[PDB]
Design an enzyme around this catalytic site. Structure first.
Site, PDB file in Angstrom:
ATOM      1  N   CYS A 251      34.195  74.581   8.202  1.00  0.00           N
ATOM      2  CA  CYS A 251      35.593  74.922   8.436  1.00  0.00           C
ATOM      3  C   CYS A 251      36.589  73.867   7.962  1.00  0.00           C
ATOM      4  O   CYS A 251      36.589  72.725   8.437  1.00  0.00           O
ATOM      5  CB  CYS A 251      35.827  75.234   9.920  1.00  0.00           C
TER       6      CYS A 251
ATOM      7  N   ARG B 278      39.948  72.580  10.618  1.00  0.00           N
ATOM      8  CA  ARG B 278      39.704  71.832  11.853  1.00  0.00           C
ATOM      9  C   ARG B 278      40.751  70.859  12.375  1.00  0.00           C
ATOM     10  O   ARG B 278      40.615  70.356  13.491  1.00  0.00           O
ATOM     11  CB  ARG B 278      38.346  71.146  11.792  1.00  0.00           C
TER      12      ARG B 278
ATOM     13  N   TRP C 239      43.959  81.743  11.166  1.00  0.00           N
ATOM     14  CA  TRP C 239      44.790  82.351  10.134  1.00  0.00           C
ATOM     15  C   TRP C 239      44.117  82.115   8.796  1.00  0.00           C
ATOM     16  O   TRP C 239      43.280  81.225   8.660  1.00  0.00           O
ATOM     17  CB  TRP C 239      46.238  81.844  10.141  1.00  0.00           C
TER      18      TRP C 239
ATOM     19  N   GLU D 291      40.555  82.740   0.293  1.00  0.00           N
ATOM     20  CA  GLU D 291      39.530  83.631   0.841  1.00  0.00           C
ATOM     21  C   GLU D 291      39.824  85.088   0.501  1.00  0.00           C
ATOM     22  O   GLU D 291      38.921  85.847   0.149  1.00  0.00           O
ATOM     23  CB  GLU D 291      39.389  83.443   2.349  1.00  0.00           C
TER      24      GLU D 291
HETATM   25  C1  HEM Z   1      43.392  78.058  12.155  1.00  0.00           C
HETATM   26  C2  HEM Z   1      43.082  78.274  10.827  1.00  0.00           C
HETATM   27  C3  HEM Z   1      41.800  78.247  10.264  1.00  0.00           C
HETATM   28  C4  HEM Z   1      41.564  78.126   8.924  1.00  0.00           C
HETATM   29  C5  HEM Z   1      42.616  78.003   7.817  1.00  0.00           C
HETATM   30  C6  HEM Z   1      40.124  78.153   8.740  1.00  0.00           C
HETATM   31  C7  HEM Z   1      39.465  78.233   7.493  1.00  0.00           C
HETATM   32  C8  HEM Z   1      38.098  78.400   7.273  1.00  0.00           C
HETATM   33  C9  HEM Z   1      37.493  78.606   5.977  1.00  0.00           C
HETATM   34  C10 HEM Z   1      38.232  78.652   4.644  1.00  0.00           C
HETATM   35  C11 HEM Z   1      36.182  78.802   6.185  1.00  0.00           C
HETATM   36  C12 HEM Z   1      35.143  79.113   5.109  1.00  0.00           C
HETATM   37  C13 HEM Z   1      34.262  80.285   5.519  1.00  0.00           C
HETATM   38  C14 HEM Z   1      34.360  81.455   4.576  1.00  0.00           C
HETATM   39  O1  HEM Z   1      34.168  81.250   3.353  1.00  0.00           O
HETATM   40  O2  HEM Z   1      34.618  82.584   5.057  1.00  0.00           O
HETATM   41  C15 HEM Z   1      35.971  78.706   7.620  1.00  0.00           C
HETATM   42  C16 HEM Z   1      34.743  78.791   8.272  1.00  0.00           C
HETATM   43  C17 HEM Z   1      34.513  78.685   9.644  1.00  0.00           C
HETATM   44  N1  HEM Z   1      35.486  78.502  10.600  1.00  0.00           N
HETATM   45 FE1  HEM Z   1      37.459  78.063  10.252  1.00  0.00          FE
HETATM   46  N2  HEM Z   1      39.488  78.249   9.946  1.00  0.00           N
HETATM   47  C18 HEM Z   1      40.485  78.344  10.898  1.00  0.00           C
HETATM   48  C19 HEM Z   1      40.216  78.555  12.263  1.00  0.00           C
HETATM   49  C20 HEM Z   1      38.977  78.629  12.892  1.00  0.00           C
HETATM   50  C21 HEM Z   1      38.779  78.770  14.322  1.00  0.00           C
HETATM   51  C22 HEM Z   1      39.887  79.132  15.317  1.00  0.00           C
HETATM   52  C23 HEM Z   1      37.437  78.635  14.546  1.00  0.00           C
HETATM   53  C24 HEM Z   1      36.704  78.636  15.738  1.00  0.00           C
HETATM   54  C25 HEM Z   1      37.233  78.482  17.010  1.00  0.00           C
HETATM   55  C26 HEM Z   1      36.841  78.465  13.250  1.00  0.00           C
HETATM   56  C27 HEM Z   1      35.460  78.436  13.037  1.00  0.00           C
HETATM   57  C28 HEM Z   1      34.839  78.456  11.790  1.00  0.00           C
HETATM   58  C29 HEM Z   1      33.410  78.580  11.587  1.00  0.00           C
HETATM   59  C30 HEM Z   1      32.364  78.518  12.685  1.00  0.00           C
HETATM   60  C31 HEM Z   1      33.200  78.752  10.259  1.00  0.00           C
HETATM   61  C32 HEM Z   1      31.903  79.124   9.540  1.00  0.00           C
HETATM   62  C33 HEM Z   1      31.855  80.632   9.268  1.00  0.00           C
HETATM   63  C34 HEM Z   1      30.742  81.035   8.308  1.00  0.00           C
HETATM   64  O3  HEM Z   1      30.083  80.137   7.744  1.00  0.00           O
HETATM   65  O4  HEM Z   1      30.536  82.250   8.106  1.00  0.00           O
HETATM   66  N3  HEM Z   1      37.782  78.468  12.255  1.00  0.00           N
HETATM   67  N4  HEM Z   1      37.147  78.474   8.252  1.00  0.00           N
HETATM   68  O1  6NI Z   2      38.238  82.399  12.062  1.00  0.00           O
HETATM   69  N1  6NI Z   2      37.573  81.708  11.095  1.00  0.00           N
HETATM   70  O2  6NI Z   2      36.532  80.926  11.463  1.00  0.00           O
HETATM   71  C1  6NI Z   2      37.938  81.795   9.792  1.00  0.00           C
HETATM   72  C2  6NI Z   2      36.966  82.164   8.830  1.00  0.00           C
HETATM   73  C3  6NI Z   2      37.356  82.261   7.380  1.00  0.00           C
HETATM   74  C4  6NI Z   2      38.805  81.948   7.037  1.00  0.00           C
HETATM   75  C5  6NI Z   2      39.527  81.932   5.813  1.00  0.00           C
HETATM   76  N2  6NI Z   2      40.825  81.577   6.046  1.00  0.00           N
HETATM   77  N3  6NI Z   2      40.858  81.391   7.385  1.00  0.00           N
HETATM   78  C6  6NI Z   2      39.703  81.585   8.085  1.00  0.00           C
HETATM   79  C7  6NI Z   2      39.287  81.509   9.433  1.00  0.00           C
END
Ligand code: HEM
Ligand code: 6NI
Ligand code: HEM
Ligand code: 6NI
Ligand code: NA
Ligand code: ZN
Lengths: 400, 400
Positions: free
Chosen positions: B104, B107, B276, B281
């Site tokens: 992520c 973070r 968000w 993506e």
């Molecule tokens: C607030 C804005 C956030 C942004 C911009 C963001 C962005 C991202 C991005 C770009 C990825 C790459 C995964 C993909 O290619 O689909 C990702 C993965 C992930 N995010 Fe974040 N995230 C956010 C919030 C969160 C929150 C709120 C959580 C958990 C409480 C979280 C948990 C994770 C996890 C566990 C992954 C791995 C998912 C996977 O590998 O399928 N994210 N996030």
């Molecule tokens: O909620 N998420 O872990 C999550 C997963 C993928 C993307 C791409 N932009 N933002 C994200 C948030």
């Protein structure tokens, strides 16, 4: 025991059985992955394995010749602590090293490699002559050909032959009084070393650096490549007329000269090799890295792009056009070059070929996927297994 | 002992001391790196460690309350084979799980996560209400807020709560008789499951799928999300007037719903979270991946690009504009969104914060670096260390 390797674009699955035979050990452990990080009896073991590889390659494993060769190698090591490779073995070894390079996306060409045997080299002057002949052959007036020149192996009773330069052709980097750098910032150290050794520098942005060549147990000697031997390409854009005015250019021949070639336990600290450029290395890395020429902002400003906010993607737009210019320019000048789409597509074929041939292929995903438009290329969606096989090209400490 | 981590753009060096404290083990070995691959007493040791983490976080480690809590947990496990978390611990645990997610890039916002305790959920119907509530809170008419709703944990002698859908909002994928797919190819399986369970399928490219919610020891129940709750953004381009006519759109809320939340040995198979979108993506992966909407060629043709040769970089040019359309459209609709430049920049700050806070940060380089213009962002030039820490979000087998 065999890692399952999946391609997420098509869904195809393969199993890397070759990895189970990896010679040395990498930096990763079950506790943490370090994949993104850039950097007597033992000799016999490696030697025997290499000889086994050689005879297996010529479909003569287990033959009298094979057994005789193994015995000879053992005899030489027992008497001298080292051994002499046969010409055909050096050729085979060099090709395997390229074949085994995890970070090289152009490996589909591995079997097409001209090997120059310079193991009889005695001086820095002779080193220079060998290097000039390599450059001439490799450049081939624009129709580049892959080549490697192998200098004498490391010996227990003398110093190593070394090429101080990182590539045979590199541009000088001069630190300015105001703290900035004119030329290539990546080359500041070698540039200053050349000056320290007697070279009066130029004052341009693209000054070809002299070669600092080192013969065993002797200080390095300065040599200037005849300009006629260094093929360069002036950069212009197909539609953006002002691009040519930037006065940008790049050299035709990418020739890594600071790596160590390892064959059957033997080490060759000086063995420069070359192929041809993949456009992104020039257009994205050399010209756009913030720590390199860093021309992105200037180009975007000339493109009348809104550099006020990141969301306009002005950086992405400028980088794409710079890459277009590199491709357009090399093609116009008739100098071999390959775009990232064609290069990555050919690597997918290489993976297929290698799966059939050895049941796998050592590949470093972070390096194989191009610096721009990663997910637009097939390799991005391909899982990979990274491991070390020998023969190999290895990094080594700078001679100074 | 402590991996040396270098940033190649600036030359800064740090040591990840946090990795040496990583609980679970990964897929890598010194023999080979698999970094690019997508996929009573034991419980007590995990529980104690988490309780220790909680008390350290409130600066009360070693207190009578800390000891009393450890004893309380041990007593519960001996009497039931499991234990219950206090609300404060649940909140802390959920935040740490996000903080610990190596893949992520968002973070930096970890501490601002809003945690909803739905451990009192009695049925699939109540699960649906909780989900709709989450969507309403999180969407907030475009001003997105990160949140997670935690449903009842896994426990012996009872089935699990499960959300069959990969995300709360997904577009249907209909396999056409001619082999093609109408809609999102990634959602073919879930679309067909919804149909089987009594869903009347549509025929559009952007049909919002119904929720297939599973309560313990009960077959999955179908639930339709009220259209007014699913905020969507029509895609248009700031200069390419024909772009709007393509009828492209995407939803505002990215809510992963098939991951397992692990806290102190406890497992929560249903704990949907959302934040968000990072523009790439949608613009690059969802719309341009070959195995997804695959709109690249169509957009390039409309842009009047020469799709005959790869060297023109038509794919790259089209992808950039699609990403521009996404950013422009979300900003126009006033729906929270972040471009890859701003996101990666914020991640570099997060790394700095974490180095000072915990002496390291588990990060998966391959996932942190954006799918386009990788080297144009700061994260590309940053070495990272990937490891598993708990609390954590983990992948789990599909309920079917
Ligand atoms: C607030 C804005 C956030 C942004 C911009 C963001 C962005 C991202 C991005 C770009 C990825 C790459 C995964 C993909 O290619 O689909 C990702 C993965 C992930 N995010 Fe974040 N995230 C956010 C919030 C969160 C929150 C709120 C959580 C958990 C409480 C979280 C948990 C994770 C996890 C566990 C992954 C791995 C998912 C996977 O590998 O399928 N994210 N996030
Ligand atoms: O909620 N998420 O872990 C999550 C997963 C993928 C993307 C791409 N932009 N933002 C994200 C948030
Ligand atoms: C034929 C054209 C070739 C192409 C298009 C190609 C392309 C590439 C690219 C894009 C990289 C990664 C970026 C970099 O390291 O700067 C690379 C690395 C590498 N290539 Fe190739 N290559 C070619 C030929 C060769 C040849 C002839 C050899 C050796 C006989 C070779 C050996 C390697 C090695 C050892 C590396 C790793 C360099 C490092 O770790 O810094 N390549 N190549
Ligand atoms: O010959 N090589 O090892 C080599 C090294 C870097 C690049 C970049 N484009 N082509 C290359 C070839
Ligand atoms: Na280069
Ligand atoms: Zn690894």
């Amino acid at each position: 025991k065999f890692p399952r390797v999946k391609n997420w674009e098509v869904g195809s699955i393969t199993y890397d059985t070759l990895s189970a035979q990896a010679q040395q050990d990498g930096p990763c452990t079950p506790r943490r992955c370090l994949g993104s990080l850039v950097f007597p009896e033992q000799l016999l073991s490696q030697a025997r394995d290499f000889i086994n590889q050689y005879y297996s390659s010529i479909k003569r494993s287990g033959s009298q010749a094979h057994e005789q060769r193994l015995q000879e190698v053992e005899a030489e090591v027992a008497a001298t602590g080292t051994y002499q490779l046969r010409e055909s073995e050096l050729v085979f070894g060099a090709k395997q090293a390229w074949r085994n390079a995890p970070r090289c996306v152009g490996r589909i060409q591995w079997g097409k490699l001209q090997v120059f045997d310079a193991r009889d080299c005695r001086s820095a002057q002779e080193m220079f002559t060998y290097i000039c002949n390599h450059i001439k052959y490799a450049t081939n007036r624009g129709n580049l050909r892959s080549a490697i020149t192998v200098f004498p192996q490391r010996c227990p009773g003398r110093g190593d032959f070394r090429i101080w330069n990182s590539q045979l052709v590199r541009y000088a980097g001069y630190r300015q009084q105001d703290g900035s750098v004119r030329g290539d910032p990546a080359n500041v150290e070698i540039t200053e070393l050349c000056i320290q050794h007697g070279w009066t520098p130029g004052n341009g942005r693209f000054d070809v650096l002299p070669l600092l060549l080192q013969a065993p147990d002797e200080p390095p000697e300065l040599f200037l490549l005849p300009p006629e031997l260094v093929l360069e390409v002036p950069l212009e854009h197909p539609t953006l007329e002002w691009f040519a005015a930037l006065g940008l250019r790049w050299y035709a021949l990418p020739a890594v000269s600071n790596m160590l070639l390892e064959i059957g336990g033997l080490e060759f600290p000086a063995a420069p090799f070359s192929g041809w450029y993949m456009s992104t290395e020039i257009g994205t890395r050399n010209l756009c890295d913030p720590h390199r020429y860093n021309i992105l902002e200037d180009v975007a400003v000339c493109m009348d792009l809104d550099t006020r906010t990141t969301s306009s993607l002005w950086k992405d737009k400028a980088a794409v056009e710079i890459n277009v210019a590199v491709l357009h320019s090399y093609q116009l000048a008739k100098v071999t070059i390959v775009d990232h789409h064609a290069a990555t597509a050919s690597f997918m074929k290489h993976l297929e070929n290698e799966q059939k041939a050895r049941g796998g292929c050592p590949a470093d995903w972070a390096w194989i996927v191009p610096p721009i438009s990663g997910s637009l290329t097939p390799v991005f969606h391909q899982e990979m297994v990274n491991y070390f096989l020998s023969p190999a090209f290895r990094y080594q400490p700078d001679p100074w």
